[PDB]
Amino acid sequence: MYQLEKEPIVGAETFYVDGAANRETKLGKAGYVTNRGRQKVVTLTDTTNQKTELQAIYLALQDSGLEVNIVTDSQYALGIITQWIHNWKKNVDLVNQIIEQLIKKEKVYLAWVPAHKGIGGNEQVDKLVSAGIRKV
Numbered sequence: 001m002y003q004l005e006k007e008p009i010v011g012a013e014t015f016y017v018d019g020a021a022n023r024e025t026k027l028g029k030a031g032y033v034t035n036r037g038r039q040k041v042v043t044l045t046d047t048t049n050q051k052t053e054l055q056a057i058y059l060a061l062q063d064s065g066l067e068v069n070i071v072t073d074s075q076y077a078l079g080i081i082t083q084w085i086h087n088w089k090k091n092v093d094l095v096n097q098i099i100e101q102l103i104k105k106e107k108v109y110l111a112w113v114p115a116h117k118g119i120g121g122n123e124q125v126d127k128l129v130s131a132g133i134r135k136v
């Protein structure tokens with residue numbers, strides 16, 4: 001990939017990603033739902049909210065084709081990726097794994113939306129990852 005796309009990629013699968021963690025137990029979940037009806041959730045241990053957001057993006061990169069749209073509610077995760085591309089043109093291992101996957105893509109669009117603002121795909125993945133982690 002040459003850059004993050006300036007707008008969504010026509011014809012590419014869209015992954016709504018999210019993570020949830022609990023500070024008392026360090027238990028969490030990460031996952032995605034896609035516009036093509038795919039979904040995945042994984043359970044995590046010794047994790048944090050920010051780590052789960054990175055894990056969700058890693059899953060989306062791993063499971064997507066060469067062109068992908070990713071919608072996250074994490075400014076932290078968005079910033080990690082934007083900063084790396086910049087320097088190219090905390091959570092060190094996870095970040096390296098994400099960059100490893102990112103560089104294999106042909107095109108990537110990555111957009112931020114606010115959490116808990118009624119945004120469809122984002123609310124769907126939030127329900128999936130927060131169950132058993134965050135109290136309703």
Ligand SMILES: O=c1[nH]c2ccc(S(=O)(=O)c3ccccc3)cc2c(=O)n1O
Pocket residue numbers: 018019020073074115116126130
């Ligand atoms: O990235 C984030 N940031 C959040 C910030 C606040 C809340 S909250 O629990 O305080 C909340 C819940 C419901 C409505 C408003 C705020 C939840 C989240 C969340 O689930 N994800 O994924």
Ligand SMILES: [Mn+2]
Pocket residue numbers: 018019053073074115
């Ligand atoms: Mn989130």
Ligand SMILES: [Mn+2]
Pocket residue numbers: 018019020115126130
């Ligand atoms: Mn959430």
